[PDB]
Design a protein around this ligand. Structure first.
Ligand SMILES: O=C(O)c1ccc(-c2nn(C(=O)c3ccccc3Cl)c3ccc(Cl)cc23)c(OCc2ccccc2)c1
Ligand SMILES: O=C(O)c1ccc(-c2nn(C(=O)c3ccccc3Cl)c3ccc(Cl)cc23)c(OCc2ccccc2)c1
Lengths: 257, 264
């Protein structure tokens, strides 16, 4: 258990670290998506020609490779954020690897929702915007690989969470005591209890009209687990189909077992 | 919603849960701890004797003679029997019968799998499972040891149960939790999501308060119980994949066609 002023201090600590670790914030992403600004307007990629012009090997692959490159970048930013979570770096080292192995993907989809609306996703630190249409229309398995992310984002974004909320929620995901192969579950759950308490109080003060948002947000962790599972199975199909294509070692290790 | 209203809802659901389900968790734990001794099925010979002596309804011979198949089919028979108990309990949830009839059917169709896994945990410990309203006890080792895919079909249930039971929920907790599962607004094909999520919001409030008063020492048990809905969705998805593999591999399975229709 934790006292109220301590929970507020924990939320601010985590928000502060989240700002320092993730360069493209939800607040910034929404300002770019909403427009009414002449200085932050993205170039829109909606077909092959605008893709060619936007840049100033096969297209579905190039886009896929672009996604993997950005995901590796996200794993780095998420890893840096995790170190800031009080108690994380004090855990057994093998458990640190384990929590990150199973948590980074759930966080990537979570934070990817910040870059999405129902019509597309921001890319290249907000400078570009690729339409859901164009991604959904990619050939072979790649088209169907993009759309389920949009489906989750539309539902997740309906919760209207801001960055200060997401900062604690991401922490809760990482500090999951039910990951396979964890050696010392007890110290992980003690931290998650602190984070969960901090999330609860945070949501109450920041969304007081939004009844049971706490519970509704935790139920979204179920959606996350599903899409991470869907993702892995699609990668295996691409691995057996496109054998000229290579994954980053960091990603390679993450998906082993 | 006021605190006294939440307790009234909780008590309402508990009373109905007692009436709808034959073997409560409270009773099951009395049998499992040894506190009227159940017949124990731990191998082939004891199975033969129990079905001759006790005569368990879901594991009487009926087309197939192979044991592992009969046990597998017996689990499905009991699951279909459970669906009716859950359906009757759902009728008691305030607001449920007022929902669109198609929506009632949709909530039950996609929810029963999660509820069965949940309530099966009440009947399990790390060593086995109660059957036939507590009269029998089938050991985990005997179930795990069934041949080809059948043994591996049984074990994941125990693995979930053991983890779930560590929350030490009681029937009054479970009655509200089961209600929350039923009123899931994200089921495919729902026509009117709003009144479903409004009811679930009431139930979640009632569940939260129940857990605070029933388990004040158990910090964030609410959140931890909500995290188990992930495990449920996961194992239910796995369950489907295992049935499909058994369906394409096992042709010793055919039952009387009317039986196939009932237990589809
Ligand atoms: O900025 C960001 O935080 C961030 C995080 C993620 C993804 C992403 N990964 N991604 C993947 O397949 C993937 C995810 C996790 C691990 C490995 C992979 Cl391989 C996507 C599939 C579809 C979509 Cl719509 C997005 C992604 C991301 O895509 C931006 C992008 C889209 C199109 C072309 C180039 C880049 C951005
Ligand atoms: O009484 C009870 O509430 C109740 C609820 C459940 C199951 C059950 N379903 N079951 C299933 O495949 C199943 C089918 C659909 C949905 C969920 C499930 Cl989980 C089992 C698999 C293994 C085991 Cl060990 C038990 C079950 C149950 O099994 C009693 C039983 C055990 C052995 C042989 C015959 C019957 C009892």
């Amino acid at each position: 258990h934790m006292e109220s002023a301590d929970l507020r201090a924990l939320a601010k600590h985590l928000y502060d670290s989240y700002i320092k670790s993730f360069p493209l914030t939800k607040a910034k992403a929404r300002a770019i998506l909403t427009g009414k600004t002449t200085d932050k307007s993205p170039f829109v990629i909606y077909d092959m020609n605008s893709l060619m012009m936007g840049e100033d090997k096969e297209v579905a692959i190039r886009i896929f490779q672009g996604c993997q490159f950005r995901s590796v970048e996200a794993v780095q930013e998420i890893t840096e954020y995790a170190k800031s979570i009080p108690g994380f770096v004090n855990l057994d080292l093998n458990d640190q690897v384990t929590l990150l192995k199973y948590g980074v993907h759930e966080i990537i989809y979570t934070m990817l929702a910040s870059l999405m609306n129902k019509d597309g996703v921001l890319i290249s630190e907000g400078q570009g915007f690729m339409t859901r249409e164009f991604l959904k229309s990619l050939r072979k398995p790649f088209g169907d690989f993009m759309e389920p992310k949009f489906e989750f984002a539309v539902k997740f974004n309906a919760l209207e969470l801001d960055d200060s909320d997401l900062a604690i929620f991401i922490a809760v995901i990482i500090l999951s005591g039910d990951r396979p192969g964890l050696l010392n579950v007890k110290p992980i759950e003690d931290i998650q209890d602190n984070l969960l308490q901090a999330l609860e109080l945070q949501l109450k003060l920041n969304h007081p009209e939004s009844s049971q948002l706490f519970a509704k947000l935790l139920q979204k962790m179920t959606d996350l687990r599903q899409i991470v599972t869907e993702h892995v199975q699609l990668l295996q199909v691409i691995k057996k189909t496109e054998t000229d294509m290579s994954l980053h070692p960091l990603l390679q290790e993450i998906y082993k077992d």
